[PDB]
């Protein structure tokens, strides 16, 4: 249900580059550049951007190609 | 403000008075009234938040749903002094705190005053949800022992539960499962500490 | 006077025998009161049917070991406490078992008796026993009146409730009541708690209107 | 023997034994009312003796704050228990009931002092005047014609206490301000409004207003209202002892 | 036994007899400043 | 001119209360009269330590 | 410390929160109070002092 | 003194809960304690 | 920062209100007071520009003054709340 | 499952009263006793003094020339007044007393819809030169209503419309010649006297019926 930023940090195992991919991803949702693949959970843009990292729908090369 | 213990709060959230959330998040309220279409001029939205109408309390709970705030005591000696929390609107003039995180803050409910901070940019909101969150800094920076260990009051309640009496009411009985053993305790036919024989599923 | 009483309820289902309901708008002096009254009724006064006595052949005591069965004699009595059988024709009936894997569906049943759990297992072979099922009101121990076992007539397994805060712009100080119920598969938790409100209203119905 | 007792003063009659030849029964005990203390706390005295009760030297006629019949009473008492109740009393926290706030046991009274001074600017010297420009009709109903709020009104945040005009010059009206003064219809006023107001979050009730006038100045309509009420109380107190 | 004690009596558990009563609690301030004023007018001040 | 204001401050959650033996405390929640533990006669307690 | 290194972190926060609820619920039902009769004095104290 | 007022000399008595209605297992200590109020109001401490 | 943002939104609404109204009623006040940014003109200086009849150009000034007042009340902003 | 059709009400004094319910089950004898205790304490109809206006003083912190006690002490004595209203909910009372004496509760001009229970309550002690004239305004409320949630010369009082003080209940086995499990519920009630004890159970049972019906 809610965002799980604890287990998502264990997949990449960096906890420092995860917020870098989440910053450029959450900025595209607020400006309206791209539509999120996962359905909206009636939350802010900073929450949906963290759930897409653990699901594997977005990545460093995926977010770079969308811009 | 003055701290206050709250037992009905989750670990990843805290308390916040309505009078403080309206002043700390003042620029955020003006952004939702203009985007919705209620007040086109920023001057008309300022007169609405001061009168505290019923419509302002609707957008105040909407802007504050997943925006974490910072809490820290006046003296800070380690990194656990600054821990981000999720504010929940309460009624009063005190800032509620979780009872389990008081061991890290090194503060007691005897008149201690803690600070508060509000991040603004999008980069700061993602920072308070990855490293400074209350659910991430469980282990102590000195040793591997957790700092969220049950405190004095909750341990006392758990020590009385895990006891063994020589003679008690409902001794020698056999229970099927944990759900069937709890049903007999609430009915009054079984004591809290009595030698029984139950079957578990681990 | 007029109180804040919601006219619509929401039921959240998780499993076939587990549900979760909630009541958001409630007064401050009524959130924990309704939760305490429903918990004492669903666990002390509830019509149901369960086994009470058993007569196994060749077993002189409950601790005396037997042959031909892999499980112990005490393990058989612990498995019979989880049986769900509904009675509609007679108050007390006797069910005889004869098999020498023991499945609850292998028991010879009559037309008046009704069994819902057919996949339940009693014991495992490497059986001559008489089962006695009757009606009751709540949890009856074997001491207060393998001959005597703990009879659990209440179909509800576990009831838990916690009072959380609500969000209402009018009063700004209310609470909600969430209830957790478990059943034995004979009846759904939606109708299980609906009968609890009928029996609770059956006491003070003639006292005041 | 106590001749007459009141909530404001206590008059006792001196016996003929411990008295001089003339002016025997001349003793006036004036009890002080609520005054602003150094720590912003109320201070009052309540009588505890009735008419017809003989007293001696060293007796207690009236008690002050935190005093009950001569005994020091700092706080109050109530039924107390010792048990952890749902973790509300975690380390030092105290859990209270509803009867402690319903009976008004810990309700205290705070007295705040607000003062205003009329300076002498180098631009233009002006005294305290009630008529001020750029004001609404809501402040005129509460403010008096002299410039002092009535005693007993519910003064809250945003309410003005006194009226003080401040002369100004070289306004340099911007073109954005010229359009505003035309849509209103009112004339331009160069005198600013720098009157004293209540700070945000402060609400109370006026109980007393004191005025001070320098030597040689003319007394306004406010200096004569309080001065007349003070001499009338002294005259009625002197005629009563007479 | 004065009049103010006739309204409320306080039971004391003191078992030792009293030999000297408690003096004035502000005697160190009244007598210290009285010597500074010296209101007494005699031949030898 | 000097004007005086009288404020009647009532007890609210967050206030600091203490005894006479050096036991400081902060009131947390003003609970109703039904949740307080009572005796068999029906006299509920006011302060729980 | 054993739950943190076996299951993970997502289940540890739920386990650490549920302990506070079951610890306070079973403590309010207990009448744990400190009375004067709790400070017992052994009868061997007067023998050692004398 | 407790014997004169027909009260238990142990100073402890079992209290009944108001929410659940069940009696406590252990007896609790009740009485009357003189409490005070300090000048630490939250109106002068809360700021934003 | 809140006072500087208020002056920005208020000034941007003035240029928007003068453009949403009639084109004839807007250019007679932009040259008199200089709200659009042009040089300010008096009654005699602006007479040789649009209309020599000083009485006719004054009647339309009151009509544009009432239209700007009515468009401000229905916009959600109060005149009494602006001065406070 | 036997339900009591008639409720026995015993009156021991003008305030204290006992209510007994004999035909009740064993499982519901303890549940109905705890459920009726919380309802009879929180929400109960009552009446108390809300607003008072004295022409002698401008604010509540002032004093009156000729009285023995302060004005604040008079406002505290008016809170303990037990007023029972039969018809309308809003009624204004008048008080007038001049000369030496003790102003009691019976000095107020009585009406057809008002009835003061106790008349021994002391309001204030007057003197020879003392004379007071004030108007009392009461209202019908449900629970605690402070002065914040509710000209010059008016005084706002913290009114408490709770007419109950102490409620208790015990469990005793009452044989009905059917089974030894049936027990009775003996519930004692202590109120201020402004309401009848025979109607307090009917009011609490009506509130519990509306909440359970909407479940
Ligand atoms: Mg401290």
From Swiss-Prot, chain A:
Report if keyword Nucleotidyltransferase is assigned.
yes
Q: What Gene Ontology terms describe where this protein resides (cellular component)?
A: cytosolic DNA-directed RNA polymerase complex
Q: What is its EC number?
A: 2.7.7.6
GO biological process terms on file:
DNA-templated transcription initiation
Q: Which GO terms describe its molecular function?
A: bacterial-type RNA polymerase core enzyme binding; DNA binding; DNA-directed RNA polymerase activity
What is the reaction catalyzed?
Answer: RNA(n) + a ribonucleoside 5'-triphosphate = RNA(n+1) + diphosphate
User: What quaternary arrangement does the UniProt entry report?
Assistant: The RNAP catalytic core consists of 2 alpha, 1 beta, 1 beta' and 1 omega subunit. When a sigma factor is associated with the core the holoenzyme is formed, which can initiate transcription.
Record-stated family: Belongs to the RNA polymerase subunit omega family.
Q: What does this protein do?
A: Promotes RNA polymerase assembly. Latches the N- and C-terminal regions of the beta' subunit thereby facilitating its interaction with the beta and alpha subunits.
Q: What is this protein called?
A: DNA-directed RNA polymerase subunit omega
Identify the species of origin.
Pseudomonas aeruginosa (strain ATCC 15692 / DSM 22644 / CIP 104116 / JCM 14847 / LMG 12228 / 1C / PRS 101 / PAO1)
- Which taxonomic lineage is given here? Bacteria, Pseudomonadati, Pseudomonadota, Gammaproteobacteria, Pseudomonadales
Q: Which gene encodes it?
A: rpoZ
UniProtKB/Swiss-Prot annotation, chain F:
- This protein's superkingdom? Bacteria
- Annotated family: Belongs to the RNA polymerase beta chain family.
What is known about its subunit structure? The RNAP catalytic core consists of 2 alpha, 1 beta, 1 beta' and 1 omega subunit. When a sigma factor is associated with the core the holoenzyme is formed, which can initiate transcription.
* Role: DNA-dependent RNA polymerase catalyzes the transcription of DNA into RNA using the four ribonucleoside triphosphates as substrates.
List the protein's name. Answer: DNA-directed RNA polymerase subunit beta
- What gene is behind this protein? rpoB
- Portion held of the full protein: 1067 to 1115 of 1357
Curated annotation (Swiss-Prot), chain G:
Query: What domain of life does the native source organism fall in?
Result: Bacteria
Give coiled-coil spans as residue ranges: none
**The name this protein goes by in its record:** DNA-directed RNA polymerase subunit beta'
**Gene for this chain:** rpoC
Which family is annotated? Belongs to the RNA polymerase beta' chain family.
Q: Report the protein's function.
A: DNA-dependent RNA polymerase catalyzes the transcription of DNA into RNA using the four ribonucleoside triphosphates as substrates.
Cite the record's note on assembly: The RNAP catalytic core consists of 2 alpha, 1 beta, 1 beta' and 1 omega subunit. When a sigma factor is associated with the core the holoenzyme is formed, which can initiate transcription.
Q: Which residues of the full protein are shown?
A: 606 to 655 of 1399
UniProtKB/Swiss-Prot annotation, chain I:
DNA-binding stretch(es), residue numbering of this chain? 43-62
Cellular location of this protein? Answer: Cytoplasm
Renumbered to this chain, region (Sigma-70 factor domain-4) spans 17-70
Q: How does this polypeptide assemble, per the annotation?
A: Interacts with the RNA polymerase core enzyme.
The record's similarity note reads:
Belongs to the sigma-70 factor family. RpoS subfamily.
Instruction: State its role.
Output: Sigma factors are initiation factors that promote the attachment of RNA polymerase to specific initiation sites and are then released. This sigma factor is the master transcriptional regulator of the stationary phase and the general stress response.
The protein's name is RNA polymerase sigma factor RpoS
> What are the top taxonomic ranks of the organism?
Bacteria, Pseudomonadati, Pseudomonadota, Gammaproteobacteria, Pseudomonadales
